[PDB]
Symmetry: C3
Subunit: 426 residues, 3 copies
Amino acid sequence: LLRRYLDYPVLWKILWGLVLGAVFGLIAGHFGYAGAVKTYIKPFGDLFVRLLKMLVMPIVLASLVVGAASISPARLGRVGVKIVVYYLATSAMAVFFGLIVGRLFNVGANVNLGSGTGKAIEAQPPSLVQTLLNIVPTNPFASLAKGEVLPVIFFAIILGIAITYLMNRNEERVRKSAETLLRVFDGLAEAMYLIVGGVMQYAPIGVFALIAYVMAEQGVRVVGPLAKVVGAVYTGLFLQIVITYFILLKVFGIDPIKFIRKAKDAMITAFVTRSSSGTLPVTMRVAEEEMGVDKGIFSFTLPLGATINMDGTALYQGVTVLFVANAIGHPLTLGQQLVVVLTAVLASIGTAGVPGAGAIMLAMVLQSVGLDLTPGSPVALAYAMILGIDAILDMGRTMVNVTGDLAGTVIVAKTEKELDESKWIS
Amino acid sequence: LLRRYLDYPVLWKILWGLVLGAVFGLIAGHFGYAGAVKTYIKPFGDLFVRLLKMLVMPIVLASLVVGAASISPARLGRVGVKIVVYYLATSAMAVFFGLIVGRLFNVGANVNLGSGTGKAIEAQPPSLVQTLLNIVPTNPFASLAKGEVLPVIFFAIILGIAITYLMNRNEERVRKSAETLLRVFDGLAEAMYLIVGGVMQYAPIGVFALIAYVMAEQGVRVVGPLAKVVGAVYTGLFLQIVITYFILLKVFGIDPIKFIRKAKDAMITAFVTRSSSGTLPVTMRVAEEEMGVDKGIFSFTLPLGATINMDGTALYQGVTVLFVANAIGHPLTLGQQLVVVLTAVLASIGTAGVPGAGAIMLAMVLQSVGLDLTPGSPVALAYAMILGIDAILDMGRTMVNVTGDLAGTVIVAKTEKELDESKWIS
Amino acid sequence: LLRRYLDYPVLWKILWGLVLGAVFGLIAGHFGYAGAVKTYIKPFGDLFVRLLKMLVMPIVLASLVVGAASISPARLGRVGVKIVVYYLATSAMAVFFGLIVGRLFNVGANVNLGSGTGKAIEAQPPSLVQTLLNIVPTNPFASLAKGEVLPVIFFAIILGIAITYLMNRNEERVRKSAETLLRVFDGLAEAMYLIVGGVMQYAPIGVFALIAYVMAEQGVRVVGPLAKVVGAVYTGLFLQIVITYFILLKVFGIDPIKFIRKAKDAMITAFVTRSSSGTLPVTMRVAEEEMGVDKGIFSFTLPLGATINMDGTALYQGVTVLFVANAIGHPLTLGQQLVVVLTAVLASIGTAGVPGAGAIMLAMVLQSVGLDLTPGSPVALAYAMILGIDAILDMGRTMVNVTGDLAGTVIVAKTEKELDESKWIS
Ligand SMILES: N[C@@H](CC(=O)O)C(=O)O
Ligand SMILES: N[C@@H](CC(=O)O)C(=O)O
Ligand SMILES: N[C@@H](CC(=O)O)C(=O)O
């Protein structure tokens, strides 16, 4: 029905598309025409993923500039520290919980890939200082072109601070220019939120392609030892939520039951669309209208958290590294655990908020702890067997990412007295 | 003389330079000093081409944004469909006319390059779905840097739609920011039109370099079987015009004689400067002041048409592919004809409006239908033989491109009743 | 202490850090802690260098636009000619002075690298016309991303001219758009000046880390034949200043003593921070508040001069080429001198204003005059010992670059009557 497709609620409609995609993938696996749906329908999902990749650099740049320029630098610094310490602490806690649930379920135990006794002693080159110096961009236009996210974030936040210093100057010729630049970037961020609204109204037909192709191709590829991985990552994410976010929220004052009951309208959308930087309008309109946090707190943290605060992806990498280490016969140790918790943070933070980017950055952590990536080694086979259920793991780790984003912004607000205390009373 | 060069009319001057360049190239070929003019004068033409390549990406981005944001989304959609269907239909018709004139003039009859009976069976991998999914940019700043055009066009048109949806919003801090971003891109597009006016003022001394070097270097290279090529491409372009544009215009109501009579002041400039995206000010100032269409049409269609709607380049590729195939001993068939008509459209649409870009993109269509591109095969020899008179073919296909752009915008206006009917009556 | 560090004067602090860096580098070389300071402290200097590279493309683009858009093209043309002629003349004079001081000190005479009698005859391929046609960018966004400066300069200056032509228009729809674009770029350039002024608050610890690492690593590497090079480059720079800038300034009317006295507050900062494009706020404020030149000059000539006018770097290259030629047995002659003076100008102009870039662009002048750059030739050893002491030469050539910039803008003002004749009396 023309014009009626758009009229269904983008939340329920996209969930309806996701719950139909599984049925259609199963009926295709019954027909056994996986090639037909890989050639016909899969391009829809790939176009949707390209659409959601188009809106990761401009949004992060413009929105970070606007957020960091709409705050007084004192309040901006306070919120920045109180949000960055939280992001790093919860990222490390998520990686540790991932390692815990890995040791508990013993993922990848009887795959028998059997890597030879060759190059195995080199295990810990953590290049901390270099991957931290790579934050400041050498040339911001380059770091925008090539696609690096964290350098663009740093440059945007320093430009925002510069602008918020400029609008207090004395020359009326230099105030009305910073004002105009800030209004330019604000118009850009708002146009990008409208574009994401459009892409999200399109997203049901894209999810019905992505998940249907994933099913029809892996309709029988979820029976082997990958069952333990997919039942370990979800248990790790649930434990992450109910043991970290609950503790934090309940300690700081907000009731976590209400937190989930209010955030579900964005948790579900992030779950279905499996993309952090593609659900910023929904999470911001559920932080403002429902969670009740003023513009100063949720116009900077949530634009930031949706690109660096990645707890789900961090736990996914933490369990997957241990899986691939257990598959070829090298279980990690205490030192390897304390180096992988250090490198998974810096490998998930630098990840863009686009689908399928949690497996790409898995290279920068497999190459980190000893392992190689050449297609000749069995680690290539394990990497492919992970990239298989990449989709079913992303569709949960993105939800946990967005939930952690909302928990962090709500906690930073509760530590700034700017909450909408009326909502949490009834 | 000082300050007199500029005051001379840019239309007559750009033709005076082209009519002097032929004579000077011929006298140089007489003197046999083609090396002297290739080392001394050619840098002028190369500077001119570099300028006209500088003025292709900013213009397309800014002007597409402004055109797509200065129109209501309903009228924008109507005109967009009515212009895209036209562009595709006329591109396919131009490619078919090129194939016809090729099959009747028998281009590439006896060159005797003699390709072996080797790799020839792989002849039709048309990657339609992938080259159509390559429209949505993965990272628009990247697609701006690397030089891709069609992704920038898509991103600019979606940003224009977002902006024209913003200026109707109620939050006053958003309307006044969308207005500021739109005026930024409008100032950019207008500065670019002024820069193109300056480049056109410079263009006579650049044409007297380009065409003079081409003459002095190919003063005798227009005698062999390339005579049939240059006499088939011009006949194909003339047939294209007088059989497609005449039919369309006379059916829709406008008299085509008057169309050419009013458009010649841009047809000639396109013919000489051999660059679509370098004559946008001239074609827009001949569509507004003379053709008589309001901004809603010549501010979007002509900025779009002069970058994707390329009938001359499409016909040139359609005849050149058949030439190359007939030269080494493999004349195309009905299926190869129906695959080359499909791939020439997508190989000319993605071409930038800069000189000498109709031979560059000839790779994406020679590599498409069977042929290879390695310098070891005779296909490299045929490719160089074409790139020889590439200039004399471009100087016509650009004119046909711009004429088709004007015909299309006039027709889309004639369906929208936006014509200035006063110019027609007399 | 806390916040007292910032309030400490930036010039005296940036000098005190550099004076303490030598002492700490020497006390480290005493303990033999070169590795410790290379692993711990050096990242601070590398972060400072990356910060000063972040602010070289946006500053040059925005500031060149706002400089060449606030000047009427009538005055802008005169100023541009009078400034580019000066820049090229003093660049060639600096290269000649470098060659003179080289021939009188005989740098690199007893290193005994001893390059064999192999490839030596190819010595003068000066590609003047091509490296001059490389000024106009092929795609300005590409020239911004990849990092080429001069194309960005040309594009920014032509956009500035287009904007200052648009502002004098009739349609109120385009005048406002041009003014808004101009104020956007003005806000951007001013935000960048604020960002730089922030970096210079952090610059003392960075220029302490840099010089401390350089000391502790080359604390004994300044005893060999590199002493003659480090004592020839400084004598060349002093000769440059006192024999070109003094004579020009005294000819045109200003007293050079007063010029040095009023410019030392930026000469010292450039000497320390060893970066031209990183001291634009200081040099512009000392040209305005102390030198006394209106926004017609010090807003365009200085943003250009501090990016293209590099006399110190040119003399550094002119002496280093002769050094590496005398080292491996190939002393230059009159023709080699008159080609190296031609190519060092175009190798210094294309050098970005970031630390350690003269050493990089030294490749584009060694490859020009005969020499190669493969790691197999002895040039991989000679070139290595020059780059070894890059700091103690760059920290002087940057000072001379900025001093020449100030001399040039002051002379262009004194030839335009805009000079503040009040400061030069007492
Ligand atoms: N879904 C992840 C990205 C990915 O794993 O592809 C995110 O939150 O950005
Ligand atoms: N002149 C063609 C391009 C080319 O063939 O170089 C155009 O219309 O854009
Ligand atoms: N010192 C030079 C740059 C360099 O050679 O590193 C300048 O002032 O721009």
